[PDB]
Each structure stands twice: as C-alpha cells, then as structure tokens.
Design a protein around this ligand. Structure first.
Ligand SMILES: Nc1ncnc2c1ncn2[C@@H]1O[C@H](COP(=O)(O)OP(=O)(O)OP(=O)(O)O)[C@@H](O)[C@H]1O
Ligand SMILES: Nc1ncnc2c1ncn2[C@@H]1O[C@H](COP(=O)(O)OP(=O)(O)OP(=O)(O)O)[C@@H](O)[C@H]1O
Ligand SMILES: [Mg+2]
Ligand code: NA
Ligand code: NA
Lengths: 220, 551, 50
RNA sequence: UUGAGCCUUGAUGUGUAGGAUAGGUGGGAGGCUUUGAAGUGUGGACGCCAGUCUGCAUGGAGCCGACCUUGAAAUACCACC
C-alpha cells in the first residue's frame, strides 16, 4: 500500500542536509502509525576489535516519549529513597525474589553502585539480554537519583551492531524540527566524544533517520 | 583486487646448502583456494610455516595484509594430555572466559567499597568491550553448536583417552573457533573418516576467506582447491585445473626434464672427448671452449622419489591357524565398541579394517597385541604367529637421534629373524639412500616420519602385521610402494585405514565397524563387499546434513 | 665446509653478539652459553641467532 | 560480444529446543491485504528435502505478533547492513 507510493515519492539517491531532510521526513504524514523514529549512524570501527566497540548512555532534552521502568537492586534503608526517587519497579537486591518474578520486563536494568551484590541468572541471563547494565555505562554509582532521573528522561544507551552501526530513538513526529535537530546534534556530539582510539575514514560513514513505517533519509 | 598474502623472492636453506624453496614469488587473493602438492620432503610444511609467520629465517619477503587473521593448523597438532575435551577446547575462546571470570571477581566491588570506582570500574568497560567484540555471554551455545557440527566427543572426556580422528577434530574445532580470514591447513584430513572429511570439504568450499591446504590426496583436492601449487624440488609451479590434468602436466614436465638431462649428458661426453685430445701443432685448442665445458659441468637435482623399495621382511613360516576371536566384546563406561564379534583369519590374508572414528579399530589392535583385555575374551593366535605392530601415533621415537640410530639402534649389523642385515643397507631400503641417514628424527618431515616409523617397526620380522593407518603422511608414490610390498608378503596383515582406494587395492577380508558396536566381518574384497550389499541392500542414499558454524 | 656461521645474541637487551660456527646438521638445537656482556659488564646468557 | 568494479532493485540465511528454514542488532506498536483475498488449480527457481519464494486464473476481508515453557523473536517498512 502506502509503501508502493512512498517508494515513488522518495529520492534517497542523494545526501540531504539535516534541515533539508526534516521537510521530507514530515512529508510522510500520509502513513498510519505512531511514527516513532529509528535514527541509525555508522562508524569507522571494527566490531571484531574490542578496543573499537562503542557503548554508553546519553541525555537528551526531550526523551523517547515512552516511560522506561528502571530497577534498583540495592534494598535496605535506601529502598524507600529508590522507590520515591523514580523507581518504577522497587525491588531490592534482597527483594529480588518476588518483584523479579512478577516483573518479566522493564526499561532500564538496576544500577546501584553502593550495593550490587546481585549477579543475575548465573549465566548472563540478564547481562546477555542487555538489560543488565554495568556501572561504567552510567547506571551503577554512589548516587541513586541518577538512575531515576535517567529513566524519567529516557536516557538512551548506545549499542554496537556487528558492523559498527549504532541505532537510537528520538520519538514520534509530534516533535518539531528544532527539537529533532537538537536531539540529533546531541547524538552526533556524543558520538564525537565516544570515537575510539582508531579514527579511520569518517566517524560517520552514513547517518540516516527514518520512521517506524516510512522511508529512511540520509542526513549528511 | 588487493591480495591477502604475498611472497617475493622467498627462499629457504636447510642444513648444508639445500634450497628447499628458491625464488617463490606469489600472491594470495581473497576467496582463493590453493592446494599445495609435492613429494614427502618437498617443503610444503616449510612453506606453510613461513606463511604462518612462525618461520622468519627465510630469504626474501613474505607478509600478509594487516588485520587479517591466519589460522594455522600444522600436521602435528599438539594437545594437553591433562586437559579434558572442554579443558582443551575453551583455549580457543579463552579471552571471553577469562574476561567473564574477571567480571565475576570485579562484581564484589559493589559489595565492598575498597578502591571503588576510579581504579577498576573504568577497566570494567574494557572487559565488557572484549566481551562485546564477540558474543561473549552466549558462549555455551556457541560451544555446543561447534561440538554438534563437528561431532566432537563429550566435554567430560579426556584428551589422552581420545582416538586420533577425534583428536584431529578437536584441533580443527579449536582452530576454527578463532574465526580467521586465511586458513593454512597441513594435511587437514590426516585421521578423518568419510563423513568428517566430506563435512570439512563442504565447509572449506563455503569458507569466505582464503584457504591454503596441503594434501597428498586427490579427491578432496578436486573438491576444495581452486588452483594447485606443485612445489617441486626448489621451485613452486602454479596450475589451474584438476588433479588428473595437473598429473598429465607433471609427467610432461618430468619427461622434458629427463630429455634435457640426457642431452646434457650427451653434450658433456662429446666435449670431454674434445678436451681429451692433443693440440695438433702450435694451434689454438682454445680457452673459451674450455671455459664453456667447465661451466657446462654443473649439478642437477634428481627427484628424491620413494618408489618401490619399501622393504617388508619375510617373517617365519605361517601355519593355517593364524588368529581367531570368539564373541569378542568390549565397552568403555556406557558406550560399547565391540559386541559379540567372532572371526578367523586364514593365512596370507590382508584384512582391511574400516569404520568411523573411535569405533574401536585401534582398540582391536590393542587386544590382538595383548595390551588390552577384552570383556568376553577368546582372542587367540597360532603358535607360529609372530606379531609386528605399527601404531596410529608416531609418538614413540626419540626426536634427538638420527635416522640411522633410531631405526637401527646403533648396531652396524641388524638382526631380522634368521638373517643378519647391514643396518645402513636396511635403512637405505626405505629411501634413506644417501646422507639422509644423518638427519634427525625431529628434523624429519611427516612423510619421512611415517617411512622411518615403518622401517623401525617392520624390523621385528613378524609374519602377522598389525598396521594402524600406515599411509597417514605418505604420498601416492610411497603409498604405491607400500601397496606393492604388502602384496608381496608371505604372511598375513591387518590394516586399518581410511583410504578406500588403498584398502581396496590390497584387502582380501573386510572387517567393517557399524553402529551399536557390531563389527561386520566379510571374507572378500571391496568389490564383492559392495556387490553383497547391493544383493541385500536398503533403499536410500543420503548420509550428511552439513549443519553450520556461524550463528 | 658444513659449519655455518652463527652469532650468539645477548639476552641483556643490548645489541651485542659473539660470533662463531656450528654444524647445523649434527647440532640443530640452538646454542646457549653464559658469556660476558661488555655493554652491561655482567656474564649473561647468549642465545643463537641468524 | 565480453571481463572487472561501483550504485540501486530484487532474491535469498533448515542447527537443538518451538507451532516452523529463526542473519544481526532494531524500535516500535499491531499492521498487512482489500491498489482484491488466509486459498484451489498451475509454471519456474532454491532446496541443509522440512519445505518458503515465485508468474498467473474466478473467487477478493483473513493470514502472523501480542501469549511464552527456547541462548534470541516473530519478512510487521525504509535503513546504513
Ligand atoms: N634442520 C634441518 N636440517 C636438515 N634438513 C632439514 C631440517 N629441517 C627440515 N629438513 C628437511 O627438509 C625437508 C622438507 O621437510 P618438510 O616438512 O618441509 O616437507 P613436506 O613436503 O612439507 O612434508 P610432509 O608433506 O611429509 O608433511 C625434509 O626432508 C626434512 O628432513
Ligand atoms: N581409557 C578409555 N576410557 C574411555 N574411553 C576410551 C578409552 N580409550 C579409548 N576410549 C574411547 O573409545 C573409543 C575407541 O577408539 P580407538 O582409540 O580404539 O579407535 P577408533 O576410534 O576405532 O579409531 P581411530 O583411532 O581411527 O579414530 C574412542 O571413542 C576413544 O575415545
Ligand atoms: Mg651471521
Ligand atoms: Na608438511
Ligand atoms: Na586410537
């Protein structure tokens, strides 16, 4: 259907300005969905190499538009603070028997730098799943309010594809051109910070931004 | 098309002054498949040891492209006898396992605040990066998939208590788990059975990277290789084509070389006749012609071709009762290899023992030689029988000793049954016909190792032979010589092998292993064995599945 | 003339070497002797090289 | 007439367990198809032989997710791949 027309409508054989592409992105209004985005960027890194694998977290002015339920696996006197600071799933490390069984999914894995005795599944059943984060990523630290604030603001984590591709969300099209430009610039500068020790070619081989149903337009 | 590997003017010199490789200039391009041919001693394993970076002594320049991984499998894959199957396997993924253990150690940080963040949490990122470079967490599944695809033994099994074929499979799995871009294989089908070889050759055909494989066989080579590197005495000769066309080209090359050498002999004799004349007056004679004759008197390298000299000494006279087994049965733990096997060996017979890997082929030889004790007993030999046994593994010779010392033990006269034989003559009967007596056992090549093994183990003079994979590293020439020697044998022999053609050209009784530990015995050769199967056959033809490696 | 020329390279890390000959056929194992190293002025191990 | 490269458009990815061919993270919710089907008859291709992809014909509104007991999830796009 609408694909069999937007394929004719698109002219994705060129490289577009970041603000000359927002008009083409908004042109997709003829499609029916919630129209979130899946902005993807490349890198001059070899995912076979450990020292070139790129991972981290960011903070953006607006958010993803979806609530991410973050956990806090450090119970005790800090359990009340974790629950009242923005812990959508208040399950302590010693309280992971029942809340963990009840909640089969969430937004952000627990991050408790002052108490992280829990391992999880004994075989990477949670770390391998990606939800289980590490303190160096930015989740586990002495502060507890940091994780709650990141969950509320929808801080997104970078994941390195097999070919060095990094994918991220900005939200639905109800965000405006200026908001989109701000978020993509934040992502680009974060990638500039997180460029590894090897800088081959261009740190952004290609950058494209697309909706959940529509086309993907290069941002150059 | 950027190459993958390059050699320019690559040359190697061995003890004294012998140019095994002289001026080998070659380039290796992506997706290539090369089969390296040659006799037993040509320099194939040398060239692959150079290509692996292990040997830098060479003259010239050999180098791969940067950031391309070379997986080198030699033709002597070594493994840790203490290690079990998993203890040997994980070394191919050791980075992920070591990093995971370090993560386990690090996770006590968030328990106890001792040197909390600025000292090890940052390095936790490097550890998670080394995990990320691979799958890391989904690693047990990777290991299980590799074991399933390669039909590995269960991880609880040790490495010393492993059959040669499964040992080679373990080496193959540990090599391919590294996931390289250029495979160097030094006889990768040394101890493999039919299904394992077929799977390996299909995998090699599917392999995206470059493959350089040394093989003395022809059918697997026709399967895998894209072109051939002949690697004659000194010089490497590329070739596009199949094994039979390459063979034809090789005979033409050798015939032309023989003709040119004969013409050289003719011309040298003529010019010597001229040199041996007088001046006849006060005239020239001439120094230019003298110089031409002196430079014409040069040296040419004869082929060190083994050919038909493999000396199997005749044993004592053999009566009609040679060997008999009754209801033989053997099991290990819960898996049973031989169950209710009975058969008698008439004199003069060659028994081709065939079957899959670790089916019990070598353990049968252990029982016959008396080093193992069967559960159901009743193994017997005639009183005239004298046993000479050749093992599947060459790990019994002192690599320090020379060829002559190791074969003969230092005694100038060698006793073989009734007749005393000169040790040097006996050793030279096995193609060590020159100063090759002085070479060291460790410095010998794989095929020369097999030849020396046969020479050392046939001297006992038994009229019953128990040969276990006797043609492992041998080429076609030594293989044919051994086949002829086996045919001209008065006694009887039992040969375990995986070469169907070699077994078919000599076997008179087939002893074939099957599933559930049944060892079918068939008196006859392979032609009539196949005819019997066709006479009473089953309706299907599809063995393999060709599972996978990736994902 | 079967005794090729070899140099024993110091293991002290400096580039210093004694030089000698060796029967490369009868003695394939690499030579190893404790000789004086005038660079560091200590008797250290020298190992065979090309 | 070809050879090589590059960009697009397609087509393709049988381990075990799983409903049955599951490439990778996606990132999100349901869309798909009705711009005529979940199919039957037919033709080719792949085929690790289970099978899913395909040009057609009247008939053209129902196929999967979501539910989870599997290391992973459901061709439900454009993607740079
Ligand atoms: N240090 C040495 N001194 C003298 N001769 C040596 C030395 N090392 C190796 N050789 C000889 O060099 C020859 C080449 O051996 P190499 O292993 O390269 O042969 P190959 O054809 O690859 O063998 P194979 O196919 O049987 O594995 C052999 O005859 C070997 O004895
Ligand atoms: N002591 C032992 N304990 C347990 N299992 C053993 C022991 N010795 C051998 N095995 C196993 O029993 C089987 C017997 O194999 P064996 O060494 O007799 O030769 P094969 O497998 O018939 O032939 P090939 O050597 O050609 O592979 C193999 O699977 C081997 O790993
Ligand atoms: Mg020198
Ligand atoms: Na070799
Ligand atoms: Na064995």
């Amino acid at each position: 259907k609408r694909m069999r027309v937007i394929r004719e409508k698109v002219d994705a054989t060129k490289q577009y300005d970041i603000n000359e592409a927002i008009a083409l992105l908004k042109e997709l209004a003829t499609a029916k969905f919630v129209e979130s985005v899946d902005v993807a960027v490349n890198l001059g890194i070899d995912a076979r190499k450990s020292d070139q694998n790129v991972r981290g977290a960011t903070v953006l002015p607006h958010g993803t538009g979806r609530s991410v339920r973050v956990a806090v696996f450090t119970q005790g006197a800090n359990a009340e603070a974790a629950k009242a600071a923005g812990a959508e799933l208040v399950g302590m490390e010693d309280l992971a028997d029942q809340i963990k069984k009840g909640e089969m999914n969430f937004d952000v894995v627990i991050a408790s730098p002052d108490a992280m005795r829990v391992v999880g599944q004994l075989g990477q059943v949670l770390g391998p799943r990606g939800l289980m984060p590490n303190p160096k990523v930015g989740t586990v630290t002495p502060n507890v309010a940091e994780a709650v604030k990141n969950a509320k603001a929808g801080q997104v984590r970078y994941r390195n594809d097999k070919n060095g591709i990094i994918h991220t969300t900005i939200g639905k099209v109800d965000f405006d051109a200026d908001k989109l430009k701000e978020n993509l610039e934040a992502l680009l500068v974060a990638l500039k910070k997180a460029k590894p020790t090897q800088a081959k070619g261009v740190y952004i081989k290609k950058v494209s931004i697309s909706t959940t149903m529509g086309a993907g337009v290069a941002v150059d | 098309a950027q190459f993958v590997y390059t050699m320019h003017r690559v040359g190697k010199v061995v003890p004294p002054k012998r140019h095994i490789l002289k001026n080998i200039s070659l380039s290796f391009f992506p997706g290539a498949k090369i089969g390296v041919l040659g006799l037993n001693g040509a320099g194939k394993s040398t060239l692959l040891r150079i290509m692996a970076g292990i040997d830098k002594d060479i003259e010239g320049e050999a180098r791969p492209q940067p950031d391309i991984k070379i997986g080198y499998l030699p033709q002597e894959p070594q493994l840790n006898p203490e290690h079990t199957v998993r203890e040997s396997i994980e070394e191919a993924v050791s980075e992920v396992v070591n990093a995971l253990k370090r993560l386990d150690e690090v996770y006590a940080l968030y328990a106890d605040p001792d040197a909390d963040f600025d000292k090890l949490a940052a390095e936790q990122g490097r550890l998670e990066e080394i995990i990320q470079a691979h799958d890391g967490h989904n690693l047990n599944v990777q290991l299980e998939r590799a074991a399933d695809a390669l039909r590995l033994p269960d991880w609880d099994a040790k490495i010393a208590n492993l059959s040669g074929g499964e040992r080679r499979r373990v080496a193959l799995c540990r090599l391919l788990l590294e996931k390289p871009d250029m495979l160097l294989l030094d006889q990768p089908t040394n101890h493999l059975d039919a299904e394992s070889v077929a799977w390996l050759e299909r995998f090699l055909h599917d392999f995206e990277g470059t493959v350089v494989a040394i093989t003395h066989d022809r059918y697997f080579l026709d399967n895998v290789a894209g072109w051939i590197l002949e690697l004659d005495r000194g010089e490497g000769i590329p070739w596009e084509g199949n094994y039979s066309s390459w063979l034809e080209q090789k005979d033409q090359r050798l015939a032309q070389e023989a003709s040119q050498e004969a013409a050289r002999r003719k011309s040298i004799e003529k010019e010597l006749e001229w040199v041996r004349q007088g001046t006849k007056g006060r005239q020239s004679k001439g120094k230019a012609r003298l110089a031409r004759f002196e430079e014409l008197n040069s040296t040419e390298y004869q082929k060190r071709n083994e050919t038909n000299e493999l000396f199997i000494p005749p044993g004592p006279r053999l009566g009609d009762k040679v060997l008999e087994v009754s209801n033989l049965r053997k099991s290990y733990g819960d898996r049973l290899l031989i169950d209710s096997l009975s058969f008698s060996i008439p004199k003069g017979a060659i028994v081709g023992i065939i079957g899959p890997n670790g089916a019990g082929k070598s353990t049968l030889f252990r029982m016959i030689s008396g080093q193992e004790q069967p559960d159901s007993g009743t193994i017997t030999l005639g009183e005239t029988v004298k046993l000479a046994s050749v093992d599947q593994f060459r790990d019994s010779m002192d690599n320090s000793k020379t060829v002559w010392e190791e074969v003969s033990g230092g005694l100038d006269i060698m006793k073989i049954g009734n007749t005393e034989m000169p040790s040097r003559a006996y050793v030279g009967r096995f193609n060590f016909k020159g100063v090759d007596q002085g070479k060291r056992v460790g410095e010998l090549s794989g095929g020369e190792r097999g030849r020396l093994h046969l020479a050392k183990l046939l001297q006992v003079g038994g009229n019953m032979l128990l040969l276990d994979q006797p043609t492992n590293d041998l080429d076609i020439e030594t293989l044919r010589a051994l086949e002829n020697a086996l045919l001209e044998f008065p006694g009887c022999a039992m040969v375990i092998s995986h070469d169907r053609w070699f077994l078919d050209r000599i076997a008179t009784h087939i002893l074939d292993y099957q599933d559930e530990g049944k060892v079918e015995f068939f008196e006859g050769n392979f032609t009539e064995y196949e005819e019997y199967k066709k006479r009473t056959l089953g309706a299907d033809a599809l063995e393999p599945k060709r599972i996978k490696y990736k994902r | 003339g079967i005794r090729e020329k070899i140099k024993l390279v110091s293991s002290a890390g400096t580039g210093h070497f004694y030089t000698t000959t060796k029967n490369k056929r009868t003695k394939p194992e690499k030579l190893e002797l404790k000789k004086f190293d005038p660079v560091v002025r200590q008797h250290v191990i020298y190992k065979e090289a090309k």
